[PDB]
Protein: Proto-oncogene serine/threonine-protein kinase Pim-1
Amino acid sequence: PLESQYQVGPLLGSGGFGSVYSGIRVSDNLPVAIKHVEKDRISDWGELPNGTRVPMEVVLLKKVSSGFSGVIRLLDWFERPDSFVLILERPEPVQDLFDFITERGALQEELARSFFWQVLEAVRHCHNCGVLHRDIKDENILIDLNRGELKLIDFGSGALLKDTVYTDFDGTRVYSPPEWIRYHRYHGRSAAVWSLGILLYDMVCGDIPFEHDEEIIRGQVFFRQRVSSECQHLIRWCLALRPSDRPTFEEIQNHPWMQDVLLPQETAEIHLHS
Ligand SMILES: Nc1ncnc2c1ncn2[C@@H]1O[C@H](COP(=O)(O)OP(=O)(O)NP(=O)(O)O)[C@@H](O)[C@H]1O
Structure:
């Protein structure tokens, strides 16, 4: 075939590992996103079930692909001499959570509850498929505005999920746990939960709680916005200094603050004016 099975549009984002463009599949007009990653900027390399040297991002995306809309679907991929090109599904209209929060400010709790629940469902899907995202954050979450459905993207910092200790990290620092900062060691699940705590704080406060290593290590959370005691409790639990003190995914979803979540479509009708 050859890459030109697609019509390239505007640049949607860069600055992380790749440059992502809006595109359209010529065959059926399907909207897609075209992500380019330079071979020299790829942190971890992996190999495909059939024996081929490809970026870990392709390995992980293949492992999570399925009918579940919570994670972006990899449609196809290509290798060039100096890069890899990934063809991803693209919702329309769409907006990433960083832009959404930047534009709208702190989210009402009902909206944050729906968004956060969906992220949880998506991360649980990843882990059940043997994949650890390692870069959960606003920029890496897409909002399908008409459907009220959130989608996780950017597996460029990810890894295969394991139960032993990780001594490597290339995700976002200010989303990284204190055990990483101090000892360069963490376990996947508890680190994911720390990042979820940063994410939830960001949603209900409009910004992240910590900027410097010192603040991460201290782990003291201050609320600048009016946030319910149940939400505050959940956030502070996710941000426990000792990893074993953090809640499992099940405890998060069983937390009182998470009860009575809106359906995605309900969410869009009320908060995204469908
Ligand atoms: N499938 C998609 N559909 C629509 N927009 C996308 C899609 N993939 C990525 N984007 C946008 O492009 C940006 C960069 O995509 P991403 O896969 O995150 O690459 P990255 O530049 O390497 N860093 P990051 O934002 O930390 O993942 C995002 O923040 C999204 O705004």
